[PDB]
Ligand binder design. Structure first.
Ligand SMILES: *[C@@](=O)([N][N]C(=O)[C]([C][C]([C])[C])[N]C(=O)O[C]C1=[C][C]=[C][C]=[C]1)C1=[C]SC([C]([C][C]([C])[C])[N]C(=O)O[C]C2=[C][C]=[C][C]=[C]2)=N1
Length: 215
């Protein structure tokens, strides 16, 4: 696999979104994974509906947390997911209002990456596209990230509290990393992004819960 790849430069990633005061991290992370696959298979790049997921996946808790896999399976069974336009983001749980007329994509299941395996995670990013991952983002260092390849020895790999999206990987001054897309707005980190340490004993549980939709 390439020693470096940036899906943002491939046109696989939509603009940075902002979840606001709702624990919809999982939804945004799932939508991001679906978005990349939609781009790869059809060549079209549009914003999907995280709100569709927040309101409709009964296995997740909406603004109270959830898992990407549940969101993916929901999309398989539901046979689709609305476009951002047909189901805009409001940042609050409400009744499932899925509109079939607005369906912009669907998926046929998902695949999980071997837990703890970063090598497995890299190979997937290289040949599949962006991958939904869960990390520990509870540290003040993280919240205040701004430059360089992020790392903090206090980061717990067993405290997976924020689902994010892995849009690539590379190396910055002899420092391998993952190109991470966040949903805390464009004014957070580096344009809503963060470079996190790669191949450094699973920094923040980066490879503990990685998965991706299949189309
Ligand atoms: C995230 O939205 N919520 N966490 C989860 O969904 C977790 C982790 C991943 C997704 C697996 N899921 C989980 O635990 O599984 C099911 C479950 C749920 C509950 C209990 C047990 C099990 C998340 C991360 S950060 C965040 C906040 C919300 C908060 C109201 C403040 N959003 C936020 O900070 O956004 C705005 C913002 C913008 C700029 C700067 C700072 C903040 N929610």
């Amino acid at each position: 696999a390439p020693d470096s790849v940036d899906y943002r430069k491939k046109g696989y990633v939509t603009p940075v979104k902002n979840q606001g005061q709702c624990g919809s991290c999982w939804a945004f992370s799932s939508v991001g994974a679906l978005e990349g696959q939609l781009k790869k298979k059809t060549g079209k790049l549009l914003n999907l509906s995280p709100q569709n997921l927040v309101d409709c996946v009964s296995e997740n808790d909406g603004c109270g947390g959830g898992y990407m896999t549940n969101a993916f399976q929901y999309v398989q069974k539901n046979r689709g997911i609305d476009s951002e336009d047909a189901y805009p983001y409001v940042g609050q749980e409400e009744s499932c209002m899925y509109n079939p007329t607005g369906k912009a994509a669907k998926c046929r299941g998902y695949r999980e990456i071997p837990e703890g395996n970063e090598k497995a995670l890299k190979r997937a990013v290289a040949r599949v596209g962006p991958v939904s991952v869960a990390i520990d983002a509870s540290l003040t260092s993280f919240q205040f990230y701004s430059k360089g390849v992020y790392y903090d020895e206090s980061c717990n790999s067993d405290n997976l509290n924020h689902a994010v999206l892995a849009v690539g990987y590379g190396i910055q001054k002899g420092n391998k990393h993952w190109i991470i897309k966040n949903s805390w707005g464009e004014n957070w980190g580096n344009k809503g992004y963060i470079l996190m340490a790669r191949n450094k004993n699973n920094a923040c549980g980066i490879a503990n819960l990685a998965s991706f939709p299949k189309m």
